[PDB]
From Swiss-Prot:
Its EC number is 1.14.15.33. The gene is pikC. It catalyses: narbomycin + 2 reduced [2Fe-2S]-[ferredoxin] + O2 + 2 H(+) = pikromycin + 2 oxidized [2Fe-2S]-[ferredoxin] + H2O; narbomycin + 2 reduced [2Fe-2S]-[ferredoxin] + O2 + 2 H(+) = neopikromycin + 2 oxidized [2Fe-2S]-[ferredoxin] + H2O; narbomycin + 4 reduced [2Fe-2S]-[ferredoxin] + 2 O2 + 4 H(+) = novapikromycin + 4 oxidized [2Fe-2S]-[ferredoxin] + 2 H2O; 10-deoxymethymycin + 2 reduced [2Fe-2S]-[ferredoxin] + O2 + 2 H(+) = methymycin + 2 oxidized [2Fe-2S]-[ferredoxin] + H2O. This is Cytochrome P450 monooxygenase PikC. The lineage of its organism: Bacteria, Bacillati, Actinomycetota, Actinomycetes, Kitasatosporales. Substrate binds at residues 83, 176-180, 227-235. SUPFAM superfamilies: Cytochrome P450. Belongs to the cytochrome P450 family. It comes from Streptomyces venezuelae.
Amino acid sequence: PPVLDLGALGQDFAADPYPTYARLRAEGPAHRVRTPEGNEVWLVVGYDRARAVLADPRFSKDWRNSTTPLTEAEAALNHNMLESDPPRHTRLRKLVAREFTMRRVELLRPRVQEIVDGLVDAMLAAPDGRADLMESLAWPLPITVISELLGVPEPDRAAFRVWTDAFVFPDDPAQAQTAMAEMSGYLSRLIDSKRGQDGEDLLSALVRTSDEDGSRLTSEELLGMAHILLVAGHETTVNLIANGMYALLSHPDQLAALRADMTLLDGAVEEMLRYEGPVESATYRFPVEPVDLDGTVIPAGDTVLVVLADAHRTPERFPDPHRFDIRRDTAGHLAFGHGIHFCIGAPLARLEARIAVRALLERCPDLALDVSPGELVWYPNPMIRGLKALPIRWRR
Ligand code: HEM
Ligand SMILES: C[C@@H]1C[C@H](N(C)C)[C@@H](O)[C@H](OC2CCCCCCCCCCC2)O1
């Protein structure tokens, strides 16, 4: 079986990748491909198998188990809980699990509500009643919340939309590398700027942790932890809010239902995650030994991508999978992963999305998509499902 080239597709595959994935699931669970970027990885498709592989400790997240080389810039950033296995994963996550529980997150609700209120105020002041939702709300909300939590100064934040329109979605390989180096350079200087200043933000608390005992949180892990916590939502929450609003605006009858009964709101957010969540493939996994998936043997050290998008379109698990239905049973979706690496930010992502979605519906009369779906442009990236821009309008 050849290597299916996804850069060849090309296309087209950016707009709607799903039939490709379903086409593979038909044959079997595991498939060699080459990305638009051009790397040889395995894809794992189909719900049951995707779910199992996410939580299977035969598939490592530690790059020591991978045969793929890292650049120096990549390596500088990889001492984080997501690119670790137990016991390191266990020790790292314990350092911040208390910060991110539902109940600690619930305390942020007034402030999140306040940030959204202000962003929409600003949005609604447009004379023509037209906006790009990505710029006015989807981007600035998550960055503002996570920057306050971690103590990134307001003037420093604009650089991050630049670095992420690079780490996450490049446009040139060397420039993703440059972005990485600059980001790491900056986070290191930010870390140093907290020392001895008695800050109460999370980054200042992590600095003292590391300084009190380097075996509990090394200086590399400290930088890794700042990095992962900061990037995670720039790539994800931004896209859930934009993909989800697009979902709703492009299924007017679901929008109408949600307007008629806002108690449906949490369920609608879940179905935005199921139908078009931002993570289309989970982060890299590395078999620690050959792994046989229904007669396909994945060799030790190869790159394995769990395709969450396909799992979410598996009809035996999610009937009429292509229907966006805000009242669907979404229980068991994979949009936040599964197993020891299950999303730590999930309560915070859900709080930000639920508040943003509610504010839009409540405050934008006759909110509409302001281009046809066919004119929207999705990033070519097959790991992150995200839009370049989301034009909307409302009645002024
Ligand atoms: C809608 C928004 C979000 C989505 C869809 C999402 C999705 C995910 C997924 C799928 C994973 C598992 C990756 C894998 O197994 O390969 C994950 C892990 C992780 N997420 Fe989230 N995420 C979101 C928001 C956030 C936010 C806001 C934060 C930071 C507060 C965050 C921090 C992390 C961290 C640190 C991990 C690694 C956890 C571990 O390895 O134990 N995420 N996320
Ligand atoms: C550590 C990984 C390595 C990948 N690589 C090509 C440099 C990158 O795309 C990924 O993604 C970001 C956010 C985008 C993927 C979201 C998956 C779940 C969020 C957890 C944080 C990962 C960081 O960070």
